[PDB]
Amino acid sequence: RVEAMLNDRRRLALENYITALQAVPPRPRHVFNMLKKYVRAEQKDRQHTLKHFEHVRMVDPKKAAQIRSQVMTHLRVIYERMNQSLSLLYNVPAVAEEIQDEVDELLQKE
Numbered sequence: 001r002v003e004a005m006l007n008d009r010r011r012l013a014l015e016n017y018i019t020a021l022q023a024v025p026p027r028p029r030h031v032f033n034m035l036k037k038y039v040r041a042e043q044k045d046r047q048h049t050l051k052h053f054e055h056v057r058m059v060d061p062k063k064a065a066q067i068r069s070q071v072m073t074h075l076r077v078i079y080e081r082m083n084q085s086l087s088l089l090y091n092v093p094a095v096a097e098e099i100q101d102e103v104d105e106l107l108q109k110e
Contacts, residue, residue: 003052003074006045013038014085021089028098031089035103039082046078 017034020027053071057064090096 003045003048006041006048010038010041010045013041014088018088021092021095026092026095028095029102031095032099032103032106035099036106038085039107042078042082046075049074049078 013034017031017038020031020034049071052074053064053068056067056071060067086096086100089099
């Protein structure tokens with residue numbers, strides 16, 4: 001149940017920044033913070049998927065090959081879901097543009 005555990009840290013992190021979004025007035029500088037945290041979470045999830053790929057391949061090689069397609073979507077879900085979160089905040093073209101500039105600039109160093 002580790003995969004689900006990683007999702008929580010990312011979920012709450014996303015739902016947490018969203019709270020500031022609705023704050024009104026929202027803190028585009030505080031909201032961008034939770035983002036870098038939520039992001040770092042989705043990263044651990046992706047890497048966690050890789051481990052599952054080889055793990056299931058060792059314990060369950062038969063199904064491991066059948067679940068491959070599932071484990072694959074997992075990695076995509078990490079980045080794909082990231083795009084979904086942006087849409088939620090994008091709702092605020094005003095904040096979305098201010099946070100996006102600093103957010104993208106904050107992860108560059110990563």
